[PDB]
Amino acid sequence: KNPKSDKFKVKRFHHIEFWCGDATNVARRFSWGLGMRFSAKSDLSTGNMVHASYLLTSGDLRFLFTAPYSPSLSAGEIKPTTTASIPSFDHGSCRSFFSSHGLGVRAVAIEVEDAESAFSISVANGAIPSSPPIVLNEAVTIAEVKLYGDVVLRYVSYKAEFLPGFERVEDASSFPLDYGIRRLDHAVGNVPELGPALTYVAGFTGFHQFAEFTESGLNSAVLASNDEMVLLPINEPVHKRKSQIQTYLEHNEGAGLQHLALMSEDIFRTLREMRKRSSIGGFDFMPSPPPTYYQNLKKRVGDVLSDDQIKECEELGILVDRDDQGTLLQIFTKPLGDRPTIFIEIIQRVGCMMYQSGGCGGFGKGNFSELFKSIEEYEK
Amino acid sequence: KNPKSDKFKVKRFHHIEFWCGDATNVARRFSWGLGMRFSAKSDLSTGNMVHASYLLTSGDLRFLFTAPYSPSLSAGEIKPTTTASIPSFDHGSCRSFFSSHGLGVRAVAIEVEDAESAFSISVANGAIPSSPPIVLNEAVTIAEVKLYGDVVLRYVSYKAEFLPGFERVEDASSFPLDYGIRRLDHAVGNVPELGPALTYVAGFTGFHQFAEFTESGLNSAVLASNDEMVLLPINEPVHKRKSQIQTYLEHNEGAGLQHLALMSEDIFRTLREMRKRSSIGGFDFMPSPPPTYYQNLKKRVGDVLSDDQIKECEELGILVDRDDQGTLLQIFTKPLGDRPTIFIEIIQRVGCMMYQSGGCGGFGKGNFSELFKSIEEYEK
Ligand SMILES: CCSCc1nnc2c(C(=O)Nc3nnc(C)o3)ccc(C(F)(F)F)n12
Ligand SMILES: CCSCc1nnc2c(C(=O)Nc3nnc(C)o3)ccc(C(F)(F)F)n12
Ligand SMILES: [Co+2]
Ligand SMILES: [Co+2]
Known part of the structure; x- marks a missing residue:
């Protein structure tokens, strides 16, 4: 039977994030291999000096590919002034993850009604915190707890287009691949x-x-x-x-x-x-x-x-x-x-x-x- | 004018080696993007416990893509007993290169008449040595000197099929792409x-x-x-x-x-x-x-x-x-x-x-x- 014992309100799978050495080449390969359209980006061209992030979509499926730039590009930033669109990102964490595991999933992300509550309730109930709730542009909230190994469960909630700081791709390179x-x-x-x-x-x-x-x-x-x-x-x-x-x-x-x-x-x-x-x-x-x-x-x-x-x-x-x-x-x-x-x-x-x-x-x-x-x- | 002052006999460009985080995904992207056929491999399936290396070819052009496995897979090896097909490879050197530069060329490789002589003559004439001459299967010889930054010039010579330890790919995945x-x-x-x-x-x-x-x-x-x-x-x-x-x-x-x-x-x-x-x-x-x-x-x-x-x-x-x-x-x-x-x-x-x-x-x-x-x- 189903006891329906969720300690907070979970809506659905939101996205999966890969940590890569080069996000460009992995995302181009996955796009062509799986028939996923390039739909959003956050990188140097959008003002992100910290990480390169490319989002592929097919239906409701969202695959995010993220790699770090040289830390020298953001050496003057602090977390309050960061150009990162995913403020849980860390250069050393990303390099350590990839050097240890190779290409793999860093984040299993689920959409919840309220990401801050889901984080508090989770940590209160034993979750190992990874990144506290951060509110992006007063529109989206993101928080992360450890799931297993170096994989995190990421909660995301909206008041109301992927994340703030991501620019939609609907141009020429956004070819509408779709294999179903x-x-x-x-x-x-x-x-x-x-x-x-x-x-x-x-x-x-x-x-x-x-x-x-x-x-x-x-x-x-x-x-x-x-x-x-x-x-x-x-x-x-x-x-x-x-x-x-x-x-x-x-x-x-x-x-x-x-x-x-x-x-x-x-x-x-x-x-x-x-x-x-x-x-x-x-x-x-x-x-x-x-x-x-x-x-x-x-x-x-x-x-x-x-x-x-x-x-x-x-x-x-x-x-x-x-x-x-x-x-x-x-x-x-x-x-x-x-x-x-x-x-x-x-x-x-x-x-x-x-x-x-x-x-x-x-x-x-x-x-x-x-x-x-x-x-x-x-x-x- | 051309003084023809080569201090050793150089024949032609032989290959270019990329150091990657994941060689699979870069090589698949390059193959499709440039029309290069997958022609040789050296990886776990060939007995290489150290690095994954995939060779693409188009005409005489050879692109090699190499990434490191976990060092734990070869923790019992020493250089005399290594399963690496490119014995100049080093896990830490590769990770340091990629973390510092991202995806890029590690080796510009030229074919010479005798790689050991070309190395000796080069170092005698001021070249900073990177990897001394190593003879592979008594058939091929390879040696490396510094070119600029972390790029090496790699000499290769043959007595007489890419390198020893590489297995030819002529199977199903070897689709004969060719864009000219x-x-x-x-x-x-x-x-x-x-x-x-x-x-x-x-x-x-x-x-x-x-x-x-x-x-x-x-x-x-x-x-x-x-x-x-x-x-x-x-x-x-x-x-x-x-x-x-x-x-x-x-x-x-x-x-x-x-x-x-x-x-x-x-x-x-x-x-x-x-x-x-x-x-x-x-x-x-x-x-x-x-x-x-x-x-x-x-x-x-x-x-x-x-x-x-x-x-x-x-x-x-x-x-x-x-x-x-x-x-x-x-x-x-x-x-x-x-x-x-x-x-x-x-x-x-x-x-x-x-x-x-x-x-x-x-x-x-x-x-x-x-x-x-x-x-x-x-x-x-
Ligand atoms: C390349 C590895 S192939 C072998 C293999 N690996 N995984 C599977 C699964 C599978 O997804 N089980 C599962 N998922 N969620 C739950 C719970 O259980 C089903 C059938 C086979 C197969 F053996 F039939 F192929 N698998
Ligand atoms: C994305 C950067 S585009 C700008 C650009 N970057 N490189 C070039 C070259 C070029 O290869 N020169 C060269 N190669 N070997 C020698 C010696 O000199 C020619 C023309 C232009 C261009 F400005 F005409 F495009 N270039
Ligand atoms: Co399954
Ligand atoms: Co040029």
């Missing part, structure tokens, strides 16, 4: 120990348990907001083969964000667009499951997807899972950067109409075993 | 003081002076090898407006590589391909000169380019210059990464046939004044 991605479905963390992480985060949010999974690799559990639109799964390693969660922890130098699942309104169109671009600057995908996996498909989702929809899953390497309430189409990219750490999931859910309920169809845990068997079935 | 770029024409450095830099480099190479320029921004001079195929211009600031060389030095935190000029066998095809991709992950170009610039074109190169070739220059924003021996088509990108530092020039030269002689048509110094006047002519 529409919003962030869930954001998954890897930690060394699940219990303490779950206890910590659920303690300061009031998020309730949504699901759990406990025999190849990991144990996980999901925290959700009251309407279960904000979904934060957390994984730990399970010590034949070496845990992929452990591989993550070793190459990331500890806990951090493992994958972002992005909802598509038409996953077949998204995967056709993304796959056409894999070899020309885009993203590569994990190897497709054997044909045996797609033979077992008609017997499990033949009532949900036509033979034509099923055959299109096989062309594209799409995975399908199903619980008692919904059906799930999913697929995974290879890692986004140099290290075998963060990757992206594309998903589309069918069912649970009331709008669609969060988590409709689960998270594809059934595909672990469905993949292990269909692999052994094709070796024959 | 064929080789590196020249590589330009910015320093605070031209004289000492010129004296230093010409001292240890024997490269001779090829050209010079001394009233908007800079003074420069060109060093060339005996056949004038290796061309290394160096700029210094000239202290109405602020020197763009000084802007470079401030945002780069000192001297470094300013621009790479890449020869195209068909600059009109290259610029059409690159411009179609500017807004979808590729490179942006500097703003085009006014129509007045292209009206003055028929009167200066009307004997070299048809009215149709001239009008195509205007569509594409291409600049044209001409000395007593050749004609030059050129254009400049905006900076390649976050900072207003490094950028790329595309060029194509017409004339000086004997093969074509290096530097045929000069370097476009006439376009500075030709641009200043044609701008004032269009304000009218």
Whole structure:
């Protein structure tokens, strides 16, 4: 059941922020690979002497890419006089994050009714503060607490266009790419120990348990907001083969964000667009499951997807899972950067109409075993 | 004249190495933006636990992109047992370079007849050593000396496929992009003081002076090898407006590589391909000169380019210059990464046939004044 125990009012996922070495090159690659439009900037051309920040959007999904300039450019600034548009930014914190983890998510940002209250209530309830509430242009409020490793949960609230200090991009370079991605479905963390992480985060949010999974690799559990639109799964390693969660922890130098699942309104169109671009600057995908996996498909989702929809899953390497309430189409990219750490999931859910309920169809845990068997079935 | 005073045998430009935060994302962006094929790799999948290195090629042009892994992955290695394919690499040097300069060229690499001799002769003649000669798999030899700032000149020689330890990419991800770029024409450095830099480099190479320029921004001079195929211009600031060389030095935190000029066998095809991709992950170009610039074109190169070739220059924003021996088509990108530092020039030269002689048509110094006047002519 859903106890609806949120200690403050959470509205939805707002944005994800990557900390980069060069924000330009990462953002250009992600834009082309995922079909996200360049929609706002904050950099030297807008008067920001501290950091370069570029925002990509597709539907409601917002990806922010931030890198530091030379500290010499802002050596005369103090926090009261800063040109930074994100006043929680720090040159040394950013360099230390990137040197330790490589390219990765620094901030999981959620929109709340009041960011200052959500911060106070969180820290009162055990959250480790990262950046106190700061009010931008008397219009937006931002605050940050630690989530896991060097990832922060960022609260944002509005009185009433991304952030103050960001300039809209609607010019020539704002080409309207769109491969169908529409919003962030869930954001998954890897930690060394699940219990303490779950206890910590659920303690300061009031998020309730949504699901759990406990025999190849990991144990996980999901925290959700009251309407279960904000979904934060957390994984730990399970010590034949070496845990992929452990591989993550070793190459990331500890806990951090493992994958972002992005909802598509038409996953077949998204995967056709993304796959056409894999070899020309885009993203590569994990190897497709054997044909045996797609033979077992008609017997499990033949009532949900036509033979034509099923055959299109096989062309594209799409995975399908199903619980008692919904059906799930999913697929995974290879890692986004140099290290075998963060990757992206594309998903589309069918069912649970009331709008669609969060988590409709689960998270594809059934595909672990469905993949292990269909692999052994094709070796024959 | 050309004294042909090379203190060792230089053959040609071999490659350019970028030091990055994430080599994957920079290399994917450059590949798509410039039309360069992914042709070799050295990373975790090849057994390199130290650095990720990806090589792009177009014609004879080779761009190498390298980033460090976590040092923990190779904590048990020593230089005699290293898994690095480029043994001059150092984690701390790479992080310090990138944190200080952002994305930029670390190595200008030239092919010589014998890299060990070229290193010895260079250091004997005043070169500051960076990495002593190392022989890779008894097949290739590599050595490095300081060029300017934190840029090194890298010598490479072969007894007889890029480097030992690199695996060829000819698979699916090796899509054969090609927009016409064929080789590196020249590589330009910015320093605070031209004289000492010129004296230093010409001292240890024997490269001779090829050209010079001394009233908007800079003074420069060109060093060339005996056949004038290796061309290394160096700029210094000239202290109405602020020197763009000084802007470079401030945002780069000192001297470094300013621009790479890449020869195209068909600059009109290259610029059409690159411009179609500017807004979808590729490179942006500097703003085009006014129509007045292209009206003055028929009167200066009307004997070299048809009215149709001239009008195509205007569509594409291409600049044209001409000395007593050749004609030059050129254009400049905006900076390649976050900072207003490094950028790329595309060029194509017409004339000086004997093969074509290096530097045929000069370097476009006439376009500075030709641009200043044609701008004032269009304000009218
Ligand atoms: C490149 C790694 S591929 C292996 C792999 N990695 N993650 C997954 C997931 C997944 O997202 N689980 C999840 N998300 N939130 C919760 C809670 O649980 C489903 C299926 C597979 C697969 F094994 F079927 F591919 N995965
Ligand atoms: C984004 C900056 S645009 C301004 C600009 N920056 N560099 C140039 C060059 C140039 O490459 N000179 C050179 N190369 N080797 C030597 C020696 O000399 C020619 C023309 C112009 C221009 F002013 F005409 F554009 N430039
Ligand atoms: Co998932
Ligand atoms: Co040039």
